[PDB]
Amino acid sequence: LPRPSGTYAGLPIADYGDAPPLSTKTMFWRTSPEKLPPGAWEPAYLGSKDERVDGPSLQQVMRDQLKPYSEPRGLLPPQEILDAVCDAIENRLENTLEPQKPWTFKKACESLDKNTSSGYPYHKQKSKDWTGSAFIGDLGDQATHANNMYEMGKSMRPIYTAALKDELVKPDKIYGKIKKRLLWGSDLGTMIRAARAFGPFCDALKETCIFNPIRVGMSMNEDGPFIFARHANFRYHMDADYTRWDSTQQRAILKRAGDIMVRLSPEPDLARVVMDDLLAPSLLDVGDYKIVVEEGLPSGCPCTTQLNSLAHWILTLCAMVEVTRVDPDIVMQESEFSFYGDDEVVSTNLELDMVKYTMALRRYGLLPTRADKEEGPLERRQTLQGISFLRRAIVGDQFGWYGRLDRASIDRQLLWTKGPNHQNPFETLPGHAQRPSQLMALLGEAAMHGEKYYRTVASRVSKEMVVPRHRSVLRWVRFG
């Protein structure tokens, strides 16, 4: 790790790799031996061992995912606008966030998801070194060292591990041009430091997820109705529907978001050291090599999705301010935003030139796309109905607004179920005894589509009855 030399997928090699091989397995199993409807989604490509198609290696698929990181960046928004929007944003957070006490090492440790990997360098499930209150063994060593560096304000180089997302995808991403989504896996030391540094801010932010636009932490079922009611106070509604959000980010933008997180943290000088590490040119371990990724979002650790949401807030406000020429905090008097990483809903009373708005977005290097996928510009509508958020269509009736999962995704979840990793997606789980709460929730989702549809998906079990009456589950899913 002196200085880089060599190139992989268009990016500089900084070191030999330590990551385990990409997974060739999926967690999805068919729920029935029957034949899939034509055009059905299926688990993403499993690589050379994947019986369904002869395709490239997982590594080559990953190589494709890394291309956008060497694309030239877009332009910075005009400096004066950028400063004004960041100030307005930080100021809104000062007026809303409840000041927090610092997180302990112990709190940082309990916060981590114990079911995912520790990443570099042990790449073991976190629970495997977890007593219930602390990390011991290898993980305990790594945790404790990182924590000492944190308290001394000393810098550590994060090391991320590249992976590919096991998820259902439309058949074309398997039988046409193979595509599978890139994942950044943080290292345990970095997760510890980020958690201690930023946990307080993130908790304060979540408590605020209804009246601030960063919606991370919200309950669709509990908060959706209030949040959507808010959006509906405004005349115009839209969704830029971005392509490649994370890989098109500018670190310079991310650093402005980071500055805000730092200043709003209980231990700002300790949190600066950590943020500077997160945002410095990143080491990504693709297996054979660790490569240097200077640009785009390094999406590994616990609080990046808030960092990303914050960057999104900054950009959206920048574009709106540039076009309408109204002050960032005045725009926020006339608008309601929802952000969750790249996911967005923007509602405003302001009269926005959509051609200019799209061009500004594209100029910052973002890739917004129209619903109909035709050559731009973005459209705006005068009804919230039809826009979506967190994968749920936004619906309004006489009782209020709410998020509804579309019939296709409901159908899909009836066709697949989660289980241990395996090679052949079309295998049926022999367990024939799953889906406790899952099923119930699916009844909930379906009830919201009317009795006709609900009666069909009440099909059914098992392989314990019986079907709750439609009225009853509809009432239960919408109301207290």
Q: Which residues bind Mg ion (CB under 5 A)?
A: 239, 343, 389
C-beta of residue 403 within 8 angstroms of C-beta of residue 392: yes
Give least dist CB 297 to ligand RBV, A.
6
How many angstroms separate the CA atoms of 480 and 477, rounded?
8
Phi and psi based region of residue 466 (left: phi greater than 0; alpha: psi -120 to 50; beta: remaining): beta
Does 241 appear as a known binding residue?
Answer: yes
In terms of Cβ atoms closer than 10 Å to its own Cβ (0-12, 13-18, 19+), residue 147 is buried
- CA pair distance 258, 274, nearest whole angstrom: 10
- Tell me which residue has its CB nearest to ligand RBV: 341
The answer to whether the annotation marks 411 as part of a ligand binding site is no
Q: Are 347 and 382 in contact (CB under 8 A)?
A: no
Residue 327 interacting entry, from ligand RBV, a copy of itself, Mg ion, none, C-beta within 5 to 8 Å by type = none
Partner interacting with residue 239 (select from Mg ion, a copy of itself, ligand RBV, none; CB below 5-8 Å by kind): Mg ion
Which among a copy of itself, ligand RBV, Mg ion, none contacts residue 166 (Cβ within 5 to 8 A by kind)? none
Q: Does the annotation list 239 as a binding residue? A: yes
User: Residue 23 carries which DSSP code?
Assistant: P
Which residues contact ligand RBV (rule: CB under 6 A)? Answer: 246, 299, 304-305, 308, 340-343, 390
Burial of 304 (0-12, 13-18, 19+ CB in 10 A): buried
CB of 466 to ligand RBV, least distance (A): 36
Residue 21 binding result from a copy of itself, Mg ion, ligand RBV, none, given CB thresholds of 5 to 8 Å by partner type: none
Q: Half-sphere exposure of 287 toward its Cβ, with a 13 Å CA cutoff? A: 14
Q: Which of 204/303 has CB closer to ligand RBV?
A: 303
Is 343 labelled a binding residue? yes
Could you tell me the smallest distance in angstroms from the CB atom of residue 364 to Mg ion? 18
Residue 172 annotated as lining a ligand binding site: no
Q: Tell me the torsion sign for CA atoms 304, 310, 314, 317.
A: positive
CB burial of 7-37 (b: ≥16 within 10 Å; e: otherwise) equals ebbebbbbbebbbeebeebbbbbbbeeeeee
CB of 152 to a copy of itself, least distance (A): 32
Quick one: what does residue 308 bind among Mg ion, ligand RBV, a copy of itself, none, with the CB cut-off 5 to 8 Å set by partner type? ligand RBV
Looking at residue 117, the DSSP 8-state letter turns out to be B
438 binds, among ligand RBV, a copy of itself, Mg ion, none (CB under 5 to 8 A by kind): none
Residue 464: exposed, middle, or buried by beta-carbon count in 10 A (0-12, 13-18, 19+)?
exposed
Our CB check for ligand RBV shows the closer of 112 and 457 to be 112
Peptide bond into 462 cis (omega under 30): yes
Residues near a copy of itself (CB under 8 A): 92, 95-96, 98, 207-208, 211, 225-226, 229-230, 232-233, 329, 332-333, 397-400, 471, 475-476, 479-480
Nearer to a copy of itself, 110 or 207 (CB): 207
Please state the residue numbers annotated as binding site. Answer: 239, 241, 343-344, 388
